[PDB]
Nucleic acid binder design. Structure first.
Ligand SMILES: [Mg+2]
Ligand SMILES: [Mg+2]
Ligand SMILES: [Mg+2]
Ligand SMILES: [Mg+2]
Ligand SMILES: [Mg+2]
Ligand SMILES: [Mg+2]
Ligand SMILES: [Mg+2]
Ligand SMILES: [Mg+2]
Ligand SMILES: [Mg+2]
Ligand SMILES: [Mg+2]
Ligand SMILES: [Mg+2]
Ligand SMILES: [Mg+2]
Ligand SMILES: [Mg+2]
Ligand SMILES: [Mg+2]
Ligand SMILES: [Mg+2]
Ligand SMILES: [Mg+2]
Ligand SMILES: [Mg+2]
Ligand SMILES: [Mg+2]
Ligand SMILES: [Mg+2]
Ligand SMILES: [Mg+2]
Ligand SMILES: [Mg+2]
Ligand SMILES: [Mg+2]
Ligand SMILES: [Mg+2]
Ligand SMILES: [Mg+2]
Ligand SMILES: [Mg+2]
Ligand SMILES: [Mg+2]
Ligand SMILES: [Mg+2]
Ligand SMILES: [Mg+2]
Ligand SMILES: [Mg+2]
Ligand SMILES: [Mg+2]
Ligand SMILES: [Mg+2]
Ligand SMILES: [Mg+2]
Ligand SMILES: [Mg+2]
Ligand SMILES: [Mg+2]
Ligand SMILES: [Mg+2]
Ligand SMILES: [Mg+2]
Ligand SMILES: [Mg+2]
Ligand SMILES: [Mg+2]
Ligand SMILES: [Mg+2]
Ligand SMILES: [Mg+2]
Ligand SMILES: [Mg+2]
Ligand SMILES: [Mg+2]
Lengths: 156, 148, 185, 127
RNA sequence: AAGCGUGUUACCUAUACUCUACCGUCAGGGUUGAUAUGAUGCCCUGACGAGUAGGCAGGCGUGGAGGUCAGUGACGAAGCCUAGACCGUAAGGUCGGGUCGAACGGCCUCUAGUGCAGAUCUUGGUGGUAGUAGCAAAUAUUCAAAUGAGAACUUUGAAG
RNA sequence: ACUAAUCGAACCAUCUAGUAGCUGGUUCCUGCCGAAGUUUCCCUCAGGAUAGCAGAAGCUCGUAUCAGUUUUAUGAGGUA
RNA sequence: GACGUAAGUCAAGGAUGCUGGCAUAAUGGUUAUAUGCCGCCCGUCUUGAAACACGGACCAAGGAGUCUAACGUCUAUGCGAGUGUUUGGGUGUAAAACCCAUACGCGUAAUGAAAGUGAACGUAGGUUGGGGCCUCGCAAGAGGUGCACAAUCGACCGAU
RNA sequence: AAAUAUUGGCGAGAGACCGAUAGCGAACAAGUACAGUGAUGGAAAGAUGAAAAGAACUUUGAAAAGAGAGUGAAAAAGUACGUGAAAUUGUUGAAAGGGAAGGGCAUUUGAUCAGACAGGCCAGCAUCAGUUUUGGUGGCA
């Protein structure tokens, strides 16, 4: 014997978990997040791009189609804590966002479904963006901070 | 044994438990009973009173076998009868058949009176007795027969 | 920082176990630890503590000391309990018929108790027949009749025994112990 | 797979080297408490080495555990190895240093059959 | 005033205070008709943690001894080296690699000539200084030849 | 002064590991506790004994007896 | 505990749910270096040491509370008014183990210088407490008995 | 006479003794070498390999020797011989360096390294629990 023995060994039995009191409850957003509000994306592939807030998905992610024909941003999700909510809104009571959910954006060349979904949703967006002037150029231009822009004093 | 001693624990510690100030030396107060009347007097008077001085008569050529006289007490007197046959005498506590206890062969020179023997008469053969030891033997109906 | 009123980390100063490595005494401690915890009988807690005691802390109990405790009124039928050794005493000539429970009996003590009509049992037979120690009688032997105690507290005017090897005249019966030689203690 | 265990906290991954074990070669790095009357290390002055003390003791739920989560048991032959047949998750085997190369093949094959983790399954392998 | 006096707030930061975790110590407890078979165990609860001289406790290591592991080993024991790895708060333990060649460990106990940084310690070995200080008294050497691997220094001749 | 580099008593061996209240040193870890330099005596003043401080072992009991505190009542004191 | 009529739910005696990347030197460890801040040389005597106090140029090996006679406290063990086989004898697988008679030591008696004498008036005393036990009480408590121990007054033994 | 003594002599048997700075001063040509007029003082020093098989032969060099070759399980065993530590040193490689160096906490950089797919590594978000910090605002005295 190179080492003697443990006279008794610790049990191989695995303990079950104590029943935990953490119910899952729905997330309340900050009040500045209302559907149709224009948002800036602060990170991602589309850093700084200005998008329209369309739907609030069940997995606590915002649904945005800042129109693809306007600035190249497709139908995709973003985290709520990673966007800037702007004071200016655009009416979204003509867009059908019901079929878009977590399963529409589940993982497992673009789909023929996804190219046609984008055109349907932004047709009611692009047409109603034209109601008030300069938005189409506003959303087509990315946001940035200049030599003196202080976000703690800036308004959005 | 060595491995259980404080010397093994004191390894690594400089003074080995003897102190840095006192600095263990050879004989800081003297040797043996030095200074029993001068600088160890308090210890000798507190713990060994009577040590210094003279007491009574000398005794040239003392032989302790002159003064050999072991004492047996009455409450231990019946132990000199053997264990088995002792009970026979305790019943029928009467004269004309009384146990002869010869305390000299049992190794005793004087019989003392620490007392309360049973009421059985008994014949005690002793070199010496005390007045009270004899009295309780005769109060039980026995006799002290002096021997030499 | 805490203004400590008492010494911190102080041990209780009482034995929680016997220092003995007797495997059989450890079973008696194991049984009375269970008994003193699952019963509210004060006897089981007293016996458990006495089973930790050192050899001088359980002096021998004579059968004569046992028999004198049976002259108390109503104590005759009680079971004498001695957490220690019961010795024999030849100075006592009559012994009653009683049940005695002890850690140890000498051969003379066991002979005398049985010959009287009595019974000698161990502390686990006592536990079975008296689980709460009902009708028991705990006896302890004299602690301070030890010869070592004679020398405890030696000093002037205290009348204690000096620590001495050879006794007799010429051994500490002089100056310090009589007025004719200096002073008396 | 070891039994599930918490995160492993060491509280001091750095060896407690002896004071001046890098100043004099004659002073080995084996830890020795300073007994000096003036020692800044003993007196715990700021800027000096820390001293081993009971506050650094490992969590009892996690002490003696290797980073994989097993306790190491030193084995010398096949018979020492089936001591861990029922304890494969809580213990792993380590072949002793003096075991021959031809006997290491036997223990490694037997451990792989019983599903026993070996902490050194590469000793004396001519590869 | 970044000075002096005085007042107001805001702010900075101790191993101190609060809360939590982990370690240890102490104290109080729970736990046997399966204690889900280790009761010097497992677990609950609370508090506490500075330290010379010194005391006690629990451990780590070394030489040898009784027992045991039908323990390891010429398919490589012991030793040594190793900014390679792992465990322990630590004393230390274990593994890989290289070198090596014949014995040596784990555990339970026994025993001691049992653990080093000091003692102007003992014995041995080695440095920096350092290619340094120096190899300067006794007037003095020189040329050629020979020998020789090699001549300021040997031999011979000549001269001084 | 000199008496073999030795002289106000040579050198060699042994008694002899002479004694030293004096100087130096006194070898692993961690844990818990934790001082004194003051009392009396001593050919004592660089030292001891003694009491005190400290540790350990505990023992008898189980909230007592208490208390580096105050109040109330009652004394005492001869300093500012 | 809260809500809900209930069912059940909950933020109520300690983190769950969802998603992404990587699956290796990315995190981490070790080590070298750099940077911020900090860090005087250890040991010793000392009121006080980094000291312009002492020892230490370096390294290896050796290197200092041991053993014995007698003894105090405490602890463990065996037996117990006894106890101690080992001076010896017997026996032996032979310095071991096993077995044993008489003595002897200590204890079971003290005191006095000694000659000597030598320990129950009593339930081996009385009083105050005293753990435990007994009786009665649901319990609190009350009464009885009260070992050890503590205080005190007595009795007995020796000296005077 | 015997029972008793025996650190000398002779012959034996042993050891929880020491293991080459130990154990006798002396494991060895040890009371030797050496020192002192003398009395006296008095060391250091064991180990190639199983066997010498102790390196034939070639080559460079005046030679010592080197480089090969060879013996050998091994020349990382070559009589400067088992292993072969440290101090100290040479070469190579890496790194840093304005009046020392060394160290403690943390991280960057370089180099190096262990483990794991039947969840390992690093994260993001939501709703809670515990401890805090910073605001907005409401109702009362
Ligand atoms: Mg000293
Ligand atoms: Mg005087
Ligand atoms: Mg570590
Ligand atoms: Mg060291
Ligand atoms: Mg100091
Ligand atoms: Mg001011
Ligand atoms: Mg501490
Ligand atoms: Mg200390
Ligand atoms: Mg050993
Ligand atoms: Mg090896
Ligand atoms: Mg190194
Ligand atoms: Mg060999
Ligand atoms: Mg030694
Ligand atoms: Mg050294
Ligand atoms: Mg030292
Ligand atoms: Mg020196
Ligand atoms: Mg020169
Ligand atoms: Mg000249
Ligand atoms: Mg000496
Ligand atoms: Mg001397
Ligand atoms: Mg403290
Ligand atoms: Mg001094
Ligand atoms: Mg006045
Ligand atoms: Mg006055
Ligand atoms: Mg790094
Ligand atoms: Mg640095
Ligand atoms: Mg500084
Ligand atoms: Mg001074
Ligand atoms: Mg100093
Ligand atoms: Mg000095
Ligand atoms: Mg010096
Ligand atoms: Mg050494
Ligand atoms: Mg003869
Ligand atoms: Mg020698
Ligand atoms: Mg050699
Ligand atoms: Mg070899
Ligand atoms: Mg070699
Ligand atoms: Mg070799
Ligand atoms: Mg060699
Ligand atoms: Mg080196
Ligand atoms: Mg310069
Ligand atoms: Mg919260």
């Amino acid at each position: 014997s190179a080492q003697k023995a443990p006279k008794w060994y610790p049990s191989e039995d695995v303990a079950a978990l104590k029943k935990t009191r953490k119910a899952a409850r729905p997330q309340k957003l900050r009040a500045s997040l209302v559907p149709g509000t224009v948002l800036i994306l602060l990170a991602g592939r589309f850093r700084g791009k200005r998008v329209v807030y369309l739907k609030h998905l069940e997995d606590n992610t915002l649904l945005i189609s800042g129109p693809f024909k306007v600035n190249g941003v497709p139908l995709r999700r973003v985290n709520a804590r990673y966007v800037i909510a702007t004071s200016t809104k655009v009416s979204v009571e003509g867009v059908n966002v019901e079929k878009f959910n977590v399963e529409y954006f589940a993982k497992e060349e673009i789909k023929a479904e996804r190219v046609e979904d984008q055109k349907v949703v932004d047709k009611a967006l692009i047409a109603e963006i034209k109601k008030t002037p300069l938005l189409k150029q506003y959303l087509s231009a990315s946001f940035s901070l200049k030599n003196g822009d202080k976000p703690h004093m800036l308004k959005f | 044994p060595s491995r259980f001693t404080k010397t093994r624990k004191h390894r690594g510690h400089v003074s080995a438990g003897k102190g840095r100030i006192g600095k263990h030396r050879k004989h800081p107060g003297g040797r043996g009973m030095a200074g029993g009347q001068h600088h160890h007097r308090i210890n000798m008077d507190k713990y060994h009173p009577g040590y210094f001085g003279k007491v009574g008569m000398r005794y040239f050529h003392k032989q302790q076998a002159h003064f050999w006289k072991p004492v047996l007490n009455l409450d231990k007197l019946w132990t000199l009868i053997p264990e088995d046959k002792r009970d026979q005498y305790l019943k029928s506590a009467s004269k004309e058949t009384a146990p002869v206890i010869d305390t000299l062969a049992a190794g005793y020179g004087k019989i003392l009176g620490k007392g309360r023997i049973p009421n059985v008469p008994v014949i005690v053969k002793a070199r010496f007795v005390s007045k009270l030891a004899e009295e309780k033997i005769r109060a039980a109906g026995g006799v002290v027969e002096l021997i030499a | 920082g805490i203004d400590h009123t008492s010494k911190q980390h102080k041990r209780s100063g009482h034995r929680t176990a016997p220092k003995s490595d007797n495997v059989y005494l450890k079973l008696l401690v194991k049984l009375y630890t269970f008994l003193a915890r699952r019963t509210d009988a004060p006897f089981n807690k007293v016996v458990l503590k006495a089973l930790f005691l050192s050899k001088i802390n359980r002096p021998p109990v004579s059968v004569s000391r046992i028999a004198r405790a049976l002259k108390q009124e109503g104590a005759a039928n009680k079971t004498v309990v001695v957490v220690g050794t019961v010795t024999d005493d030849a100075r006592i000539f009559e012994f009653p018929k009683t049940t005695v429970a002890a850690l140890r009996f000498t051969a003379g003590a066991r002979a005398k108790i049985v010959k009287a009509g009595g019974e000698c049992i161990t502390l686990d037979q006592l536990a079975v027949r008296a689980p709460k120690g009902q009708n028991t009688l705990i006896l302890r032997g004299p602690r301070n009749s030890r010869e070592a105690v004679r020398h405890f507290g030696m000093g002037p005017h205290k009348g204690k025994a000096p620590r001495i090897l050879s006794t007799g005249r010429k051994f500490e019966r002089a100056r310090g112990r009589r007025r004719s030689k200096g002073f008396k203690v | 797979a070891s039994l599930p265990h918490p995160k492993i906290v060491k509280k001091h991954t750095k060896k407690f080297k002896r004071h001046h074990s890098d100043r004099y070669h004659r002073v080995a790095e084996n830890w020795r408490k300073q007994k000096g009357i003036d020692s800044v290390v003993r007196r715990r002055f700021r800027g000096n080495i820390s001293q081993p003390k009971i506050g650094y003791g490992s969590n009892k739920k996690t002490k003696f555990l290797s980073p994989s989560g097993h306790k190491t048991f030193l084995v010398a032959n096949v018979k020492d190895l089936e001591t861990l047949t029922m304890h494969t998750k809580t213990y792993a085997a380590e072949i002793a240093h003096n075991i021959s190369a031809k006997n290491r093949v036997v223990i490694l094959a037997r451990a792989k059959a019983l599903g026993i983790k070996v902490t050194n399954p590469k000793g004396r392998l001519a590869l």
